[PDB]
Design a protein around this ligand. Sequence first.
Ligand SMILES: Cn1cc(-c2nc3ccccc3[nH]2)cn1
Ligand SMILES: Cn1cc(-c2nc3ccccc3[nH]2)cn1
Ligand SMILES: [Mg+2]
Ligand SMILES: [Mg+2]
Lengths: 546, 546
Amino acid sequence: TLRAAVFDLDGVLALPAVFGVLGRTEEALALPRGLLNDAFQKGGPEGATTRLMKGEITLSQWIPLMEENCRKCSETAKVCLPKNFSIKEIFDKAISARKINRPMLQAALMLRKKGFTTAILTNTWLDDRAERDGLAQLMCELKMHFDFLIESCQVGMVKPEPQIYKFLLDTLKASPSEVVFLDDIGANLKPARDLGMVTILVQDTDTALKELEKVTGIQLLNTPAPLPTSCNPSDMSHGYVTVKPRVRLHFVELGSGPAVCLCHGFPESWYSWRYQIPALAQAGYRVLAMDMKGYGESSAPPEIEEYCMEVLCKEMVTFLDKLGLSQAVFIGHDWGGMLVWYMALFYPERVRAVASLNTPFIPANPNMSPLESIKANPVFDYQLYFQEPGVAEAELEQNLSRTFKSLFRASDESVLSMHKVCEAGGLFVNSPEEPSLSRMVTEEEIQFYVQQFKKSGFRGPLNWYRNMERNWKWACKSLGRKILIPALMVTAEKDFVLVPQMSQHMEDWIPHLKRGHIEDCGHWTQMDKPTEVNQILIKWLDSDAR
Amino acid sequence: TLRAAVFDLDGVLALPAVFGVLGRTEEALALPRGLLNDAFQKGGPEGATTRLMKGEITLSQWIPLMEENCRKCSETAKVCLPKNFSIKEIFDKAISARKINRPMLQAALMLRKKGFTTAILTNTWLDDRAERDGLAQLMCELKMHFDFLIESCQVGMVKPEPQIYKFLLDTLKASPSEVVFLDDIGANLKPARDLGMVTILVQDTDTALKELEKVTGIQLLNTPAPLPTSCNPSDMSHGYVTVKPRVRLHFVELGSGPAVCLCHGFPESWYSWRYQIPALAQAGYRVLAMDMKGYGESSAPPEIEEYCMEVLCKEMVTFLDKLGLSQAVFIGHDWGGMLVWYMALFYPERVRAVASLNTPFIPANPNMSPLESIKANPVFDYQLYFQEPGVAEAELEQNLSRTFKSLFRASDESVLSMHKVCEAGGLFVNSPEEPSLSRMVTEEEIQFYVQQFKKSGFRGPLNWYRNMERNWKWACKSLGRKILIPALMVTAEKDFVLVPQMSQHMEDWIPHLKRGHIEDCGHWTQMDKPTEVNQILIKWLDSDAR
Ligand SMILES: Cn1cc(-c2nc3ccccc3[nH]2)cn1
Ligand SMILES: Cn1cc(-c2nc3ccccc3[nH]2)cn1
Ligand SMILES: [Mg+2]
Ligand SMILES: [Mg+2]
């Protein structure tokens, strides 16, 4: 029956409400109870505040009218306003005080997830204050989670006028009894109730959510911790840069502030960063999430040496040059992890800071050919399988859904060891035709990877493994250096390929290295533990990159 | 005969040279003449400094070796280093002191323009200092103007070793007698001279340029003021955002710092900002240069109302939402100019500051239908011609080269009045079939516009003129407001369509409006007077947007 849910902003989605600060301001300054609220509401439907709320005038133009209203109210109550009484002041403070009410937002998210159409209905203003940006951010963060944001000042109508409800119902393509509306002002609820809408008078958040749960039949209060916001590919800004005549790099771009360039592993995609991208943007960073060379919408030339680390690094530097970035923060996972350590060693001037998930920095051994070094560790046997061009490509392309559903598994779900892969003749020889779906990924998400790898297959990606000698000789040039820029190593407890122990000597070469560790986390760190990853990266970014 | 020109960086392309600061530092601190230079050069080919220059170690690792070298030199000269003697200190200061030597760069530009291959050959270091970014910027600005940048620390070789010259000659695909090399250290010139290269010992810049002029046969000294750096379309980062299901916006993106969104006019392109894009990026801004709806690589739906100002503005706001930008600076020219004033009036929270080239802000007249208002000014008669769908499209698409070559003209070059265009039956009825090429644009640049407009023609662009009534009714809602965010109006003396006088009352609605004025400037402001435009915008950005 209920198909839509509408949330007020002041006092419902954002707290403390500003009338809150009119109450407190009167008290703090020992004025008559309600005086400020009388000034605010003066003239009712024709007063200064309605005109503001309807979009007739801007917030800066209203400020001096509210002043005058405050003078008039005070003279008629036979009191004086204090010296330095400042309307702008009180409001700037009130407006920066309000934050998103997290449990209300998550309840709106959940309802949207079970198929509700959701909206924000608010009396608000055209904000031209010097400090307008703070609310612009808050409104951006809230709005991306809802089907509609309806603002009185954009539509020329105000709660409680009945026209804005008819505008609401009509935007919603729904009938009044299909709608629940939460608001903290009972007068606002009155006309919605008249048309037959369910309404909820919002005082404390938890009781409103209890009413909302009872009315929708959906569990909203005490619900488990939700995943971070993910990314829908067709809502993103997609960027393309030609780094040389045969070679373009594609990236997804979100946010503003210091550039943070995310470099995914094998066999992955920009989309492997879906849970980090909105969080890092939201934390004040300009996120650039690559398709690395070989993948997705970046070019995938066939030649093996197009994928040695030297060339891959030179091309990432060209990518910064063409974009006009003197530096970026480089955060890599897996093969992208190895690449960011090499950016730190050969291009420190271009790297604001470097972080890697899972991939340790281990300096090349100049007395042991890397084929040798590899043969001295059973867990890297599968890399020998990867060498012969064509062999791994045929197995991995043969059925894409099976390939990613077999690879993308949480630590208690595995279906392949990387164990005697050569001996066995393949990576999947002893895994199922139709693997079950991991808890980490939906069917849709697997099909995004499938569709990406239909463009170029596994030649480019596999070629990353096919430059052992060439990478070893280049790495050997760097054996005198240390990494002395800000650096973060994050280990994953249950990555059985890139194990935490392999990172144990890194402080010898990176003396001020910082660390995070994630327990109960397999190799696919970003989608295995997105919440913990976000917290470690954002905290390290804020202290070391900013 | 000469086909290539190679410029040193320290003392040639960048000034003051750092050995300069070793001289000054000794004096300032009353140490023995040359002591610092002795420490620097200690051990010659095997000493700490060569290892740095070859890329064996980073700058941070070298600092404490130079210290020790400074201790050893001082004890052997029987003196004491002062208290707080700081190698890091001296170098940070020396490195931030060096700026681009503008006349050398312009000479390199000119030689490149007459077909020389150009390069920078420098002994430099892997810079991992806290402050590394300053040099990263300087190196970025210099490098984009040259075919190659060869750095000792990236190639593992140093001037004056003869191997780096063989590497030079081989990168240049040239023989030693086809090459001139400028350097401020004679030892560096010695081996180039041995292979038969022309060399120039650089002391004062002007004498080196005189030698370089005499040797190349090209005038380099006292040459007229060059145009700002332009953009080559295939070197840019190209960005794409879907703002709604039928509609994507394309943009070119360069730089980092506060977002600056450039909005071109009719019938134009992101490329109309080619001279502003590198300058504004270079000035510390993140430039986003749009193809506006209707143009170039943005979508061009056919319906007229898809181009009313309301919809166009809503979609620019969606563009910010998807890119994750809470605000941008909006700078418009012509129709893009009108649009940015409307962004300031309806979305002040999303606009950091607003500037317009040529387009004044004139509030709608609510007592006069705009068709009327238009008919009351002979200079806007041509807009009536634009109304009837199809008519102007056929004339303007009929021959694209002629269309842009007729439109894109400097003020003393015109071939069309906008005068009795209806009466005459067309915009070009009395202009030539094959117009001469304006001084403002090359043949190539016209052909970029031609190729852009082959994608969608003139329907979308013309539709911007086809919403007079609809724009008037929307604009009327804003008649109570003023524009109170930071705002810049730039008038063009000889724009005979959007004349300076039409802007004269703007202070009534925008009380703190700032102004620029450009004399001897026609309607195509950005390409007519690129140098002056850049200076006015960058100065207004730095004071008001930053
Ligand atoms: C740098 N590096 C990356 C790997 C690796 N092997 C894999 C095998 C399967 C899936 C992901 C994998 N990632 C090893 N070394
Ligand atoms: C907002 N606005 C733009 C114009 C205009 N007319 C033109 C006629 C020709 C070329 C460019 C032109 N630009 C008038 N008003
Ligand atoms: Mg409220
Ligand atoms: Mg020099």
